Amino acid sequence: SYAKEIDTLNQHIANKKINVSFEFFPPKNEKMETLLWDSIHRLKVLKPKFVSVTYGANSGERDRTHGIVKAIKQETGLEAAPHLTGIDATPEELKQIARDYWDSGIRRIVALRGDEPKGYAKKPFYASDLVELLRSVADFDISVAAYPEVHPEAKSAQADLINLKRKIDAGANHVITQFFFDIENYLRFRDRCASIGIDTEIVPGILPVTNFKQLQKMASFTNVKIPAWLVKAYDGLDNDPTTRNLVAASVAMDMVKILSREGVNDFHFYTLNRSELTYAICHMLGVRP
Amino acid sequence: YAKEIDTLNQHIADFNKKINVSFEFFPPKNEKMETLLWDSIHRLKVLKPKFVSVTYGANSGERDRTHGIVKAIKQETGLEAAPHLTGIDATPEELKQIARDYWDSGIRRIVALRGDEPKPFYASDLVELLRSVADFDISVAAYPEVHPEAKSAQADLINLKRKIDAGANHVITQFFFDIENYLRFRDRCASIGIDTEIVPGILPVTNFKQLQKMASFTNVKIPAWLVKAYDGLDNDPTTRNLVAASVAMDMVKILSREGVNDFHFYTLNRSELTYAICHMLGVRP
Ligand SMILES: Cc1cc2nc3c(=O)[nH]c(=O)nc-3n(C[C@H](O)[C@H](O)[C@H](O)COP(=O)(O)OP(=O)(O)OC[C@H]3O[C@@H](n4cnc5c(N)ncnc54)[C@H](O)[C@@H]3O)c2cc1C
Ligand SMILES: Cc1cc2nc3c(=O)[nH]c(=O)nc-3n(C[C@H](O)[C@H](O)[C@H](O)COP(=O)(O)OP(=O)(O)OC[C@H]3O[C@@H](n4cnc5c(N)ncnc54)[C@H](O)[C@@H]3O)c2cc1C
């Protein structure tokens, strides 16, 4: 029965050093700037492995990422990783960014391709190229993106998995997944990563669902399937944030309990600059002050 | 394991089976508590519960107060409201007066319990008594982890069957956290021939100090994992509500999968967790 195997899984979660990383995005107003620093001081007591700050491809808010990453190291002492994108800049520009990050104190970069505006011919620049360039400059710990449900522009699922191995070969040593809700398809993909020869954990990116209409927006660009029961679980909650936050805690803690049973001990949270759900999920993981 | 919680969630979202829920409130003892109670009632009423119910402080003498909340709920909302009644502090004739007056209000369901004096009068005796006044639907208490004063599990079970044969037709459990034990208890009730649902009393754990208090009187066991899940959260209401959501909705998803379509919520006069738990079951405005 289900009763005996949720009581075992609760007690297993009740000895392993779990590692957690938090992703923040650069804010754009004084409301969101305050929401972000609230979250940073709340979450720091869990001693995360690192925290990261996303990067506006062509948003012009490229300079905001670098300043936050410096301020986090300053005022909290957490290791902070900028994300960095390729399509926006020339190699000289990227080598200068990388050089200054390294002389700054930054040891981990999250290296991504970025997306061209919708409808644009793609530039023959890819993430493996940014990884090679970053390793030209210094010994960066480098984190790259994996797509358990295949990246929407990939030639094939085979080619996208070969690409991930290619990014590891170029020198990336940390892997973070796109968010997902099919836990079984993540596990299967994780094993394919061990088959091809990738030796770091395929670290799951956990996205707490606090606004469903926003999730429908994000998940359309990205090819991740939204299960039917999740759509049902959120119908009628458009003006009920309190219920949304509770439905979300159960969903995310279910995920994270199940990944933990299957031997995932590394979690990357898309906090969207809020702290409520990430703190509680970590808490239920045993990641506590 | 993963396909286990995925098909679990897709049976909770696919079941068109009518799920009967009911909410328990307690009589407020100040102005704050009263505002809280009435916002809960107006927030939970849209979900169309089978009934709502209002507890009774045995020796308190607040029985006029329990009766007052009940009449008020029926007038303001339309809900079927059910009083809790205890026969431990009242003479039998008083109890018959209380029942006739309840019946002329339009009350049709009474939750009938012994209560505890701080008398050889048991709950099956109050059930016989109510039933001689009128054709009440009567709900009674069941104890999956044995009532602390029973000599034995089998005797506490024989007792519960005595209350059914005495005229009751609804069963509501003390709260619990060992679900496998609840399921084995419901099997025994089936065997010994009780023909109503053994309806789970769901208690959302919004405050673990309060739960520690309620659970000492009651011989109800707190799992080691439940203590762990609340360690360090004395001053974190936000994290406690989120932790409580995951605890309740696992319990309710499993119970629902095993065929239990009837839930009774110990709302503790707050509506946040109950409205969310019902929402996930498919109970919606
Ligand atoms: C954890 C995470 C963090 C992210 N952070 C950011 C961020 O800060 N800013 C931002 O703008 N975006 C960010 N993204 C989004 C990301 O930029 C997009 O998903 C983008 O569309 C792909 O980026 P990539 O780094 O995975 O590129 P790549 O790994 O290069 O792959 C992209 C696509 O190109 C294909 N491909 C790879 N190599 C070749 C080749 N040689 N020839 C042909 N096709 C090839 C792949 O199969 C895939 O379809 C993030 C994504 C994740 C998962
Ligand atoms: C859903 C629910 C609602 C409640 N509401 C209230 C409330 O509003 N107010 C309140 O004060 N309390 C309330 N209680 C608490 C309840 O009154 C206590 O658990 C009380 O100790 C027993 O009540 P009961 O109706 O189950 O009694 P009983 O069914 O009579 O059981 C009491 C004990 O006596 C034993 N027993 C039964 N018959 C006999 C017999 N003939 N000879 C010897 N032993 C016997 C039983 O096995 C049991 O151990 C509630 C409990 C529940 C589960």
XYZ file of C-alpha atoms and ligand atoms in Angstrom:
680
model
C 0.000 0.000 0.000
C 0.961 3.683 -0.255
C 0.650 4.076 3.533
C 3.724 2.019 4.468
C 5.950 3.645 1.798
C 5.256 7.315 2.663
C 6.039 6.592 6.375
C 9.369 5.012 5.344
C 10.153 7.961 3.025
C 9.308 10.507 5.748
C 11.639 8.704 8.195
C 14.479 8.444 5.637
C 14.306 12.232 5.196
C 14.197 12.520 9.022
C 22.265 11.693 7.966
C 23.109 12.784 4.409
C 24.773 16.131 3.723
C 22.286 17.634 1.284
C 23.658 20.503 -0.828
C 21.371 23.354 -1.871
C 21.854 26.229 -4.336
C 19.506 29.229 -4.746
C 18.885 31.142 -7.987
C 17.913 34.827 -7.913
C 17.185 37.211 -10.738
C 18.243 40.868 -10.915
C 15.398 43.093 -9.680
C 14.102 46.132 -11.522
C 12.222 48.272 -8.928
C 12.488 49.143 -5.252
C 9.704 46.671 -4.394
C 11.529 43.727 -5.985
C 14.961 44.923 -4.769
C 13.619 44.726 -1.191
C 11.958 41.352 -1.811
C 15.317 40.002 -3.011
C 17.433 41.147 -0.092
C 14.788 39.960 2.371
C 15.156 36.527 0.762
C 18.971 36.616 0.717
C 19.337 37.248 4.450
C 16.595 34.719 5.232
C 18.105 31.969 3.105
C 21.775 32.490 4.041
C 21.470 30.695 7.390
C 20.992 27.406 5.512
C 24.639 27.756 4.348
C 23.935 26.959 0.668
C 26.713 25.591 -1.527
C 26.397 28.695 -3.697
C 23.782 31.243 -4.770
C 23.461 32.411 -8.361
C 22.114 35.487 -10.169
C 20.598 35.214 -13.650
C 21.650 37.370 -16.599
C 19.599 39.359 -19.077
C 20.694 38.103 -22.513
C 20.080 41.476 -24.253
C 18.210 43.022 -21.331
C 20.823 45.740 -20.804
C 20.593 44.660 -17.182
C 23.836 42.836 -17.796
C 25.536 45.261 -15.389
C 23.018 44.470 -12.608
C 24.071 40.828 -12.390
C 27.731 41.694 -11.711
C 26.926 44.229 -8.981
C 24.569 41.951 -7.044
C 26.995 39.015 -7.197
C 29.578 41.323 -5.633
C 27.160 42.601 -3.005
C 26.169 39.077 -1.936
C 29.841 38.130 -1.371
C 30.199 41.413 0.526
C 27.245 41.464 2.898
C 26.687 37.727 3.414
C 29.914 35.890 2.579
C 28.028 33.278 0.567
C 29.820 32.100 -2.550
C 27.983 33.824 -5.415
C 27.955 32.762 -9.076
C 26.897 35.016 -11.954
C 25.169 33.535 -14.927
C 26.769 34.565 -18.217
C 25.441 34.338 -21.759
C 27.128 34.049 -25.125
C 24.922 35.484 -27.878
C 25.056 39.100 -26.580
C 28.824 39.660 -26.750
C 32.041 39.013 -28.637
C 34.805 36.711 -27.297
C 36.994 39.678 -26.288
C 34.019 40.983 -24.257
C 33.434 37.588 -22.647
C 37.153 37.172 -21.918
C 37.136 40.590 -20.205
C 34.013 39.716 -18.188
C 35.636 36.405 -17.166
C 38.969 38.038 -16.297
C 37.318 40.609 -14.020
C 35.008 38.073 -12.348
C 38.110 36.051 -11.477
C 40.105 39.001 -10.166
C 36.897 39.925 -8.272
C 36.802 36.654 -6.285
C 34.236 34.730 -8.293
C 35.159 31.075 -8.761
C 31.886 29.707 -10.171
C 30.168 30.878 -13.351
C 26.877 29.526 -14.721
C 27.526 29.422 -18.464
C 24.599 29.555 -20.887
C 24.022 30.186 -24.546
C 21.151 32.613 -24.280
C 18.403 32.905 -26.867
C 18.220 35.210 -29.852
C 14.985 37.227 -30.221
C 12.150 35.051 -31.470
C 12.367 34.627 -35.235
C 16.099 35.381 -35.574
C 18.628 33.270 -37.422
C 20.709 31.607 -34.722
C 24.402 32.581 -34.401
C 26.715 29.515 -34.638
C 27.771 30.179 -31.018
C 26.796 27.630 -28.349
C 27.392 27.063 -24.647
C 30.318 24.669 -25.124
C 32.007 27.630 -26.850
C 31.508 29.841 -23.776
C 32.838 26.999 -21.573
C 36.036 26.716 -23.638
C 36.513 30.493 -23.546
C 35.988 30.649 -19.754
C 38.515 27.868 -19.202
C 40.949 29.820 -21.435
C 40.979 32.521 -18.752
C 41.170 30.698 -15.401
C 40.123 27.587 -13.436
C 36.445 28.356 -13.105
C 34.072 25.915 -11.588
C 31.473 26.031 -14.392
C 27.782 25.030 -14.221
C 25.840 24.234 -17.416
C 22.192 23.561 -18.311
C 20.631 20.116 -18.876
C 17.205 19.484 -20.437
C 15.557 16.297 -19.140
C 12.650 16.756 -21.597
C 15.051 17.716 -24.474
C 15.842 21.284 -25.429
C 13.238 22.624 -27.908
C 15.812 23.556 -30.577
C 17.814 20.316 -30.393
C 18.390 18.127 -33.435
C 17.251 15.109 -31.375
C 17.267 13.863 -27.820
C 20.495 11.994 -28.697
C 22.129 15.176 -29.987
C 21.087 17.166 -26.887
C 22.568 14.563 -24.557
C 25.757 14.482 -26.645
C 25.835 18.279 -26.333
C 25.687 18.024 -22.515
C 28.621 15.604 -22.561
C 30.323 18.085 -24.914
C 29.905 20.894 -22.376
C 31.400 18.641 -19.679
C 34.363 17.811 -21.917
C 35.031 21.515 -22.507
C 35.450 21.889 -18.725
C 32.121 22.380 -17.015
C 32.003 20.369 -13.784
C 28.462 21.090 -12.490
C 25.088 20.429 -14.160
C 21.716 22.085 -13.359
C 18.469 20.956 -14.999
C 15.625 22.927 -16.440
C 12.633 22.738 -14.120
C 10.313 19.755 -14.569
C 7.291 17.940 -13.118
C 7.755 14.420 -14.603
C 9.976 12.915 -11.888
C 10.176 9.573 -13.689
C 11.482 11.238 -16.843
C 14.161 13.072 -14.864
C 15.434 9.823 -13.303
C 15.556 8.138 -16.695
C 17.460 11.099 -18.150
C 19.828 11.185 -15.155
C 20.754 7.547 -15.881
C 21.354 8.319 -19.544
C 23.806 10.934 -18.322
C 25.707 8.330 -16.352
C 25.680 6.020 -19.421
C 27.233 8.569 -21.804
C 30.011 9.187 -19.214
C 29.063 12.286 -17.243
C 30.258 11.997 -13.662
C 28.719 14.903 -11.797
C 25.221 14.775 -10.440
C 22.535 15.991 -12.794
C 21.292 18.506 -10.196
C 17.498 19.047 -10.412
C 16.235 22.594 -10.651
C 13.228 22.805 -8.302
C 10.655 25.498 -9.232
C 7.993 26.138 -6.541
C 4.699 26.936 -8.318
C 3.387 30.026 -6.539
C 1.620 31.523 -9.590
C 0.200 29.111 -12.140
C -0.436 31.592 -14.972
C 3.204 32.694 -14.759
C 4.267 29.019 -14.945
C 2.169 28.540 -18.113
C 4.079 31.503 -19.562
C 7.534 30.150 -18.626
C 6.798 26.561 -19.616
C 5.667 27.424 -23.145
C 9.086 28.647 -24.346
C 10.881 25.740 -22.790
C 9.162 22.445 -23.849
C 8.579 21.175 -20.271
C 5.290 19.281 -19.999
C 2.771 20.483 -17.402
C 0.930 17.353 -16.174
C -2.854 17.376 -16.205
C -3.151 16.965 -12.444
C -1.047 20.118 -11.920
C -3.408 22.121 -14.149
C -6.311 20.744 -12.141
C -4.518 21.440 -8.863
C -4.386 25.130 -9.765
C -7.694 25.758 -11.528
C -9.756 28.448 -9.840
C -6.828 29.666 -7.713
C -6.082 32.802 -9.788
C -6.984 35.130 -6.898
C -6.047 32.776 -4.015
C -2.314 33.144 -3.346
C -2.590 31.542 0.094
C -4.036 28.335 -1.294
C -1.545 28.410 -4.173
C 1.332 28.514 -1.705
C -0.002 25.461 0.187
C -0.759 23.401 -2.965
C 2.779 24.287 -4.067
C 4.455 23.151 -0.845
C 2.855 19.737 -1.078
C 3.787 19.417 -4.773
C 7.415 20.479 -4.287
C 7.983 18.502 -1.070
C 6.545 15.447 -2.810
C 9.055 15.904 -5.643
C 11.976 16.515 -3.350
C 11.112 13.573 -1.070
C 11.030 11.306 -4.117
C 14.284 12.582 -5.617
C 15.890 12.183 -2.200
C 14.822 8.542 -1.978
C 16.291 7.913 -5.462
C 19.625 9.295 -4.219
C 19.585 12.946 -5.313
C 21.481 14.910 -2.637
C 21.835 18.177 -4.596
C 19.074 20.722 -5.192
C 18.996 24.040 -7.088
C 15.965 26.212 -6.244
C 14.449 28.789 -8.620
C 13.416 31.087 -5.798
C 12.055 33.856 -8.077
C 13.469 36.059 -5.293
C 10.907 34.814 -2.702
C 11.998 32.748 0.307
C 8.851 31.128 1.781
C 8.718 27.840 -0.133
C 12.465 27.339 -0.610
C 13.114 27.711 3.152
C 10.369 25.221 4.053
C 11.361 22.639 1.396
C 14.959 22.859 2.603
C 13.659 22.564 6.173
C 11.792 19.364 5.302
C 15.037 18.154 3.684
C 16.894 18.563 6.962
C 18.673 21.643 5.598
C 18.108 23.865 8.634
C 20.006 26.690 10.485
C 8.048 5.142 -6.618
C 7.754 8.235 -8.839
C 5.009 6.690 -10.987
C 3.381 5.940 -7.592
C 2.856 9.569 -6.503
C 2.154 10.601 -10.123
C -0.740 8.128 -10.531
C -1.763 8.973 -6.957
C -2.176 12.668 -7.933
C -3.967 11.745 -11.183
C -6.544 9.634 -9.309
C -7.190 12.547 -6.912
C -7.715 14.883 -9.911
C -9.800 12.391 -11.976
C -12.294 11.084 -9.398
C -15.797 12.421 -10.017
C -16.893 10.583 -6.842
C -18.794 12.928 -4.553
C -16.608 13.539 -1.511
C -18.433 14.422 1.711
C -16.583 16.814 3.982
C -17.529 18.289 7.326
C -15.949 21.001 9.485
C -15.658 21.178 13.299
C -15.600 24.556 15.071
C -15.190 25.406 18.754
C -17.054 28.188 20.642
C -14.912 31.332 20.836
C -13.971 32.706 24.253
C -13.092 36.302 23.243
C -13.618 38.906 20.518
C -10.529 37.997 18.481
C -11.495 34.318 18.346
C -15.031 35.288 17.306
C -13.901 37.266 14.262
C -11.659 34.350 13.304
C -14.495 31.818 13.576
C -16.931 33.831 11.482
C -14.500 34.532 8.653
C -13.790 30.785 8.594
C -17.490 29.954 8.409
C -18.104 32.325 5.500
C -14.965 31.104 3.738
C -15.687 27.371 4.140
C -19.456 27.498 3.482
C -18.974 27.767 -0.301
C -17.565 24.181 -0.300
C -21.030 22.797 0.647
C -19.977 20.449 3.471
C -22.295 17.661 4.555
C -22.596 19.523 7.851
C -20.588 21.612 10.280
C -20.413 20.927 13.997
C -19.703 22.865 17.214
C -18.002 21.379 20.292
C -19.210 21.452 23.922
C -17.258 22.158 27.105
C -18.723 19.480 29.374
C -18.584 21.071 32.850
C -18.214 24.614 31.458
C -21.935 25.214 31.133
C -21.326 26.928 27.788
C -24.016 24.623 26.307
C -26.295 27.613 25.715
C -23.274 29.011 23.847
C -22.743 25.939 21.651
C -26.471 25.968 20.884
C -26.302 29.682 20.059
C -23.479 29.358 17.511
C -25.413 26.496 15.890
C -28.668 28.450 15.483
C -26.615 31.380 14.144
C -24.760 29.273 11.562
C -28.044 27.913 10.201
C -29.649 31.342 9.898
C -26.703 33.164 8.328
C -25.443 30.498 5.924
C -27.913 27.639 5.373
C -25.381 25.011 6.480
C -26.659 22.012 8.429
C -25.159 22.658 11.846
C -24.752 19.902 14.425
C -24.143 20.431 18.152
C -21.762 18.366 20.167
C -23.605 17.170 23.279
C -22.223 15.380 26.338
C -24.384 13.605 28.860
C -21.792 13.503 31.627
C -22.752 16.802 33.328
C -26.535 16.702 32.797
C -29.374 14.680 34.355
C -31.219 12.470 31.830
C -34.325 14.671 31.828
C -32.259 17.784 31.118
C -30.681 15.892 28.224
C -34.165 15.169 26.854
C -35.109 18.852 27.156
C -31.916 19.800 25.301
C -32.767 17.323 22.523
C -36.389 18.425 22.062
C -35.316 22.049 21.943
C -32.581 21.201 19.406
C -35.168 19.334 17.306
C -37.622 22.250 17.246
C -34.797 24.506 16.042
C -34.469 22.339 12.944
C -31.392 20.491 14.135
C -31.383 16.979 12.710
C -27.807 15.809 13.515
C -26.179 15.679 16.963
C -22.582 14.602 17.717
C -23.037 12.555 20.888
C -20.140 11.976 23.287
C -19.566 11.023 26.901
C -17.171 13.851 27.766
C -14.888 13.694 30.803
C -15.684 14.880 34.308
C -12.738 16.878 35.736
C -20.853 8.518 36.802
C -21.731 5.228 35.054
C -22.974 7.261 32.050
C -21.409 6.303 28.702
C -21.992 7.530 25.165
C -24.179 4.636 24.037
C -26.475 5.750 26.866
C -26.745 9.273 25.446
C -27.469 7.747 22.026
C -30.339 5.631 23.332
C -31.568 8.788 25.072
C -31.471 11.090 22.036
C -33.110 8.445 19.893
C -36.077 8.192 22.274
C -36.724 11.911 21.844
C -36.585 11.935 17.989
C -35.069 10.417 14.831
C -31.722 12.232 15.055
C -28.874 11.362 12.856
C -26.229 10.807 15.530
C -22.436 10.881 15.022
C -20.171 9.074 17.527
C -16.455 8.876 18.324
C -14.103 6.080 17.206
C -10.533 5.573 18.410
C -8.161 3.931 15.897
C -5.422 3.887 18.543
C -7.814 2.737 21.333
C -9.471 5.107 23.791
C -7.025 5.574 26.736
C -9.547 4.140 29.213
C -10.455 0.984 27.301
C -9.311 -2.304 28.755
C -8.347 -3.489 25.258
C -8.610 -2.767 21.542
C -11.233 -5.458 21.044
C -13.331 -4.047 23.900
C -13.155 -0.475 22.614
C -14.304 -1.905 19.277
C -17.201 -3.821 20.819
C -18.087 -0.495 22.430
C -18.205 1.369 19.127
C -20.530 -1.307 17.728
C -22.705 -0.842 20.826
C -23.164 2.843 19.976
C -24.171 1.993 16.402
C -26.720 -0.564 17.559
C -27.999 1.977 20.100
C -29.151 4.287 17.296
C -26.127 6.107 15.872
C -25.408 6.127 12.135
C -22.217 8.239 11.761
C -18.643 7.510 12.927
C -15.882 10.147 13.322
C -12.326 9.299 14.391
C -10.058 10.955 16.910
C -7.201 12.525 14.968
C -4.309 10.276 13.935
C -0.974 10.150 12.122
C -0.359 6.387 11.703
C -2.430 5.914 8.578
C -1.671 2.199 8.146
C -3.079 1.645 11.634
C -6.213 3.628 10.744
C -6.646 1.465 7.645
C -6.292 -1.751 9.694
C -8.821 -0.339 12.170
C -11.357 0.371 9.401
C -10.891 -3.279 8.300
C -11.828 -4.536 11.795
C -14.939 -2.300 11.894
C -15.991 -3.858 8.585
C -15.441 -7.333 10.052
C -17.368 -6.731 13.290
C -20.141 -5.423 11.065
C -20.331 -1.609 11.380
C -21.996 -0.456 8.139
C -20.990 3.255 8.019
C -17.784 4.926 6.947
C -15.194 5.187 9.728
C -14.729 8.851 8.856
C -11.231 10.287 9.447
C -10.840 13.297 11.697
C -8.164 15.300 9.887
C -6.286 17.686 12.158
C -4.029 20.085 10.214
C -0.884 20.680 12.239
C -0.552 24.450 12.240
C 1.072 24.613 15.690
C 3.145 21.780 17.113
C 3.136 23.000 20.719
C -0.671 23.052 20.664
C -0.647 19.569 19.080
C 1.668 18.329 21.826
C -0.949 19.452 24.360
C -4.020 17.961 22.642
C -2.167 14.685 22.090
C -1.066 13.997 25.677
C -4.621 13.687 27.011
C -5.610 11.444 24.155
C -3.220 8.427 23.892
C -2.594 9.466 20.252
C 0.936 8.857 19.028
C 3.143 11.509 17.434
C 5.524 9.893 14.906
C 9.238 10.564 15.303
C 9.216 11.998 11.790
C 6.428 14.409 12.775
C 8.447 15.738 15.738
C 11.436 16.137 13.379
C 9.329 17.947 10.796
C 8.489 20.589 13.402
C 11.798 20.873 15.237
C 12.955 24.485 15.256
C 9.700 25.973 13.914
C 8.249 27.386 17.173
C 8.433 30.950 15.800
C 7.936 30.139 12.071
C 4.178 30.097 11.371
C 4.822 30.388 7.660
C 6.973 27.272 7.505
C 4.542 25.417 9.797
C 1.567 26.041 7.494
C 3.568 24.789 4.484
C 4.830 21.728 6.386
C 1.252 21.122 7.586
C -0.068 21.249 4.034
C 2.269 18.493 2.857
C 1.496 16.323 5.901
C -2.276 16.621 5.566
C -2.458 16.194 1.811
C -0.309 13.047 1.824
C -2.571 11.566 4.478
C -5.719 12.601 2.596
C -4.433 11.452 -0.825
C -3.686 7.982 0.544
C -6.979 7.724 2.420
C -8.786 8.867 -0.722
C -6.942 6.256 -2.786
C -7.957 3.521 -0.331
C -11.626 4.402 -0.892
C -12.372 6.838 1.949
C -14.672 9.518 0.464
C -15.645 11.155 3.789
C -13.498 13.631 5.706
C -14.134 15.598 8.913
C -11.809 18.566 9.506
C -10.766 19.793 12.945
C -10.461 23.338 11.630
C -9.530 24.757 15.067
C -11.604 27.728 13.786
C -9.082 28.545 11.031
C -9.919 27.988 7.359
C -6.556 28.193 5.532
C -5.496 24.537 5.646
C -8.983 23.041 5.395
C -9.902 25.107 2.305
C -6.611 24.064 0.644
C -6.990 20.402 1.619
C -10.556 20.329 0.290
C -9.465 22.121 -2.864
C -6.979 19.367 -3.661
C -9.556 16.650 -2.983
C -11.841 18.169 -5.629
C -14.110 19.952 -3.140
C -14.520 23.375 -4.733
C -16.980 26.285 -5.074
C 19.757 26.313 -15.037
C 19.539 27.249 -16.193
C 19.929 28.578 -16.073
C 19.689 29.495 -17.106
N 20.082 30.831 -16.936
C 19.905 31.652 -17.937
C 20.338 33.024 -17.773
O 20.885 33.490 -16.767
N 20.081 33.827 -18.889
C 19.470 33.418 -20.067
O 19.298 34.243 -20.978
N 19.075 32.116 -20.199
C 19.291 31.292 -19.192
N 18.885 29.984 -19.334
C 18.195 29.607 -20.571
C 19.111 29.124 -21.681
O 19.955 30.183 -22.143
C 18.228 28.601 -22.812
O 17.625 27.397 -22.353
C 18.869 28.405 -24.188
O 17.805 28.276 -25.133
C 19.826 27.232 -24.270
O 21.006 27.531 -23.495
P 22.133 26.454 -23.250
O 23.191 27.078 -22.335
O 21.582 25.180 -22.701
O 22.764 26.205 -24.737
P 23.407 24.917 -25.414
O 23.839 23.940 -24.299
O 24.443 25.326 -26.371
O 22.274 24.200 -26.281
C 21.195 24.950 -26.874
C 20.626 24.163 -28.028
O 21.610 24.062 -29.079
C 21.839 22.703 -29.414
N 23.245 22.586 -29.796
C 24.330 22.581 -28.959
N 25.486 22.533 -29.577
C 25.138 22.533 -30.919
C 25.909 22.495 -32.100
N 27.246 22.441 -32.116
N 25.246 22.510 -33.282
C 23.910 22.558 -33.272
N 23.081 22.599 -32.225
C 23.761 22.580 -31.071
C 21.402 21.902 -28.190
O 21.071 20.554 -28.521
C 20.190 22.731 -27.732
O 19.020 22.493 -28.509
C 19.063 29.050 -18.286
C 18.681 27.717 -18.407
C 18.907 26.813 -17.368
C 18.443 25.388 -17.514
C -14.969 13.475 17.018
C -14.900 13.726 18.499
C -15.587 14.809 19.041
C -15.538 15.078 20.414
N -16.241 16.161 20.910
C -16.191 16.384 22.188
C -16.935 17.507 22.712
O -17.614 18.289 22.049
N -16.825 17.661 24.081
C -16.095 16.861 24.938
O -16.091 17.126 26.150
N -15.399 15.804 24.428
C -15.453 15.588 23.128
N -14.758 14.531 22.624
C -13.966 13.717 23.554
C -14.693 12.478 24.053
O -15.854 12.823 24.811
C -13.732 11.669 24.921
O -12.905 10.866 24.088
C -14.367 10.820 26.020
O -13.286 10.428 26.870
C -15.112 9.587 25.545
O -16.177 9.962 24.643
P -16.934 8.868 23.787
O -18.226 9.379 23.136
O -16.078 8.224 22.750
O -17.273 7.810 24.961
P -17.509 6.242 25.031
O -17.941 5.723 23.662
O -18.535 5.939 26.048
O -16.134 5.658 25.454
C -15.516 6.026 26.706
C -14.659 4.894 27.221
O -15.474 4.004 28.018
C -15.438 2.698 27.472
N -16.757 2.108 27.637
C -17.843 2.273 26.820
N -18.914 1.630 27.217
C -18.505 1.005 28.383
C -19.176 0.168 29.293
N -20.455 -0.196 29.162
N -18.474 -0.291 30.354
C -17.195 0.069 30.488
N -16.459 0.856 29.699
C -17.177 1.291 28.656
C -15.001 2.867 26.020
O -14.431 1.666 25.523
C -13.993 4.007 26.170
O -12.738 3.528 26.646
C -14.774 14.246 21.245
C -14.078 13.170 20.703
C -14.129 12.904 19.338
C -13.349 11.746 18.781
